[PDB]
Amino acid sequence: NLLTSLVRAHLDSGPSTAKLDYSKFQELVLPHKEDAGDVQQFYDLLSGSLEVIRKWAEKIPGFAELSPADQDLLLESAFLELFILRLAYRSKPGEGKLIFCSGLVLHRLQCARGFGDWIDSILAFSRSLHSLLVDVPAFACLSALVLITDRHGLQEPRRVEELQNRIASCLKEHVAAVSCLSRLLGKLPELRTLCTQGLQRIFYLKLEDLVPPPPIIDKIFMDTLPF
Amino acid sequence: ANLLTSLVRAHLDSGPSTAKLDYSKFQELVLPHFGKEDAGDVQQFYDLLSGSLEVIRKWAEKIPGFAELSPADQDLLLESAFLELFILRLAYRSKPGEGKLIFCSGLVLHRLQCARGFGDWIDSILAFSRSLHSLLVDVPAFACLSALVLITDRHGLQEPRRVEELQNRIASCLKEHVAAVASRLLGKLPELRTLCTQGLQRIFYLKLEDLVPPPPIIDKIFMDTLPF
Numbered sequence: 001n002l003l004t005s006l007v008r009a010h011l012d013s014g015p016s017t018a019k020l021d022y023s024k025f026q027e028l029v030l031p032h033k034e035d036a037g038d039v040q041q042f043y044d045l046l047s048g049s050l051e052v053i054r055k056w057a058e059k060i061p062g063f064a065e066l067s068p069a070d071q072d073l074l075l076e077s078a079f080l081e082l083f084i085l086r087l088a089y090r091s092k093p094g095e096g097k098l099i100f101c102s103g104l105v106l107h108r109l110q111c112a113r114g115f116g117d118w119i120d121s122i123l124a125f126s127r128s129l130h131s132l133l134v135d136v137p138a139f140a141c142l143s144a145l146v147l148i149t150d151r152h153g154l155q156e157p158r159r160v161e162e163l164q165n166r167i168a169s170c171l172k173e174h175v176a177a178v179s180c181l182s183r184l185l186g187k188l189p190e191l192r193t194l195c196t197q198g199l200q201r202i203f204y205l206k207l208e209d210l211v212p213p214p215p216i217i218d219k220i221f222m223d224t225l226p227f
Numbered sequence: 228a229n230l231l232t233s234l235v236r237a238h239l240d241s242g243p244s245t246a247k248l249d250y251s252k253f254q255e256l257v258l259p260h261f262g263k264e265d266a267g268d269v270q271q272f273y274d275l276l277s278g279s280l281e282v283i284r285k286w287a288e289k290i291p292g293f294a295e296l297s298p299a300d301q302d303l304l305l306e307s308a309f310l311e312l313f314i315l316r317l318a319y320r321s322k323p324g325e326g327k328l329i330f331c332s333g334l335v336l337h338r339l340q341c342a343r344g345f346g347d348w349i350d351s352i353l354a355f356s357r358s359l360h361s362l363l364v365d366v367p368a369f370a371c372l373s374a375l376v377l378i379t380d381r382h383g384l385q386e387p388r389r390v391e392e393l394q395n396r397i398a399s400c401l402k403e404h405v406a407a408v409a410s411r412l413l414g415k416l417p418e419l420r421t422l423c424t425q426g427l428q429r430i431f432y433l434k435l436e437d438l439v440p441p442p443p444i445i446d447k448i449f450m451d452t453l454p455f
């Protein structure tokens with residue numbers, strides 16, 4: 001029932017296989033490495049997930065019973081990790097095909113310019129995720145475990161740990177019912193490292209300042225830098 | 228010129244002699260775990276940056292007129308040019324055909340000993356060293372250009388006019404020197420700007436990772452150069 005709730009929240013947070021949008025998709029991308037249009041698209045694809053990941057989190061049983069300050073800190077801290085995990089899972093790295101939570105489908109070369117090298121690190125992680133063959137219930141727990149985790153400055157870190165423990169127990173109980181758990185849990189630290197390169201990319205783009213990040217992305221960037 | 232002689236004296240006294248080179252840490256083939264670093268690699272990176280800053284401070288003090296600029300303008304010019312000057316002097320000093328980095332202390336390090344602390348940036352600096360060496364910039368021309376990288380317009384100068392006059396004088400000194408032995412050297416100054424950005428990206432990464440914290444003086448240059 002926790003599991004059922006987590007699966008409901010996951011499946012309601014992404015596009016139906018029918019609401020997929022191939023109208024912008026380019027099978028072969030023309031030759032011709034960074035313009036204002038590329039930076040705008042990068043911030044737009046990031047910003048497309050903000051509202052979606054907040055509504056998903058609010059359907060995680062227990063999440064709305066954390067303090068409003070802890071809810072905000074967990075969302076800000078996990079935003080990039082959750083954006084990458086959900087993109088990695090949804091996408092088709094065998095075809096270099098990125099599927100965004102709007103249902104927009106883009107080839108890697110159509111967003112490489114905004115993303116920089118990071119998009120190739122994200123596709124490598126997507127290919128490693130796909131090889132584990134994570135079933136939707138397992139992924140509905142894992143994604144919740146990315147958000148519901150210790151972060152510096154939590155008001156009720158013990159209640160965050162207890163909710164994490166419940167979701168971890170829900171996941172272990174599910175993987176047993178169908179060494180493989182620890183390969184799943186192994187993807188969490190890899191996701192943390194991957195999203196360091198996301199923070200590196202935003203730093204570079206703010207230095208370059210072709211187009212500034214929209215306020216909410218800028219705040220996540222500034223707030224998650226320990227300095 | 229008298230200015231030229233002073234600029235050449237300041238330049239030559241700010242690095243090692245082909246005789247005061249410490250091969251004491253040099254190893255032609257180390258075997259590193261690439262794309263990773265330990266506390267020792269990050270501390271040495273910051274130590275080389277700190278040593279270069281102290282050396283570039285004494286060098287600037289010997290540029291005639293620099294020490295009479297306001298103390299605040301001296302600090303702003305040094306902070307704003309530091310990374311540019313570190314890269315330019317390292318590229319000019321180094322031996323990229325042997326993968327040899329030569330630091331202002333005279334310390335010689337192989338490319339492979341620098342890869343852990345510096346990351347990609349050390350390989351981009353050696354590529355710039357190859358482009359610089361193929362221009363065959365004579366010592367006096369380099370002693371002028373390096374001074375022109377420091378003594379330039381910056382946002383927040385108290386006496387921008389005195390900095391422009393000193394710039395004007397060093398430019399005149401340089402033009403009258405190239406004429407005295409008779410634009411390509413100055414088309415790699417944008418390449419040098421890119422290498423500064425890479426330097427800032429590497430410090431950002433290392434501050435994120437925080438194995439050891441940056442020295443306060445380097446940290447201030449980093450924070451003061453970022454518009455945010």
Ligand SMILES: CNc1nc(C)c(-c2ccnc(Nc3ccc4[nH]c(C(=O)NCCCN5CCOCC5)cc4c3)n2)s1
Pocket residue numbers: 237238239241242243244245315316317319320321322323324325329331360369370373
């Ligand atoms: C602004 N002030 C300054 N300017 C600089 C850069 C300074 C400095 C401080 C100490 N030593 C030196 N100079 C130095 C020392 C040793 C050197 N060896 C060579 C050399 O062999 N090259 C030949 C060029 C051909 N390529 C090199 C080999 O790999 C590829 C081909 C130059 C050199 C310069 N400068 S303080």
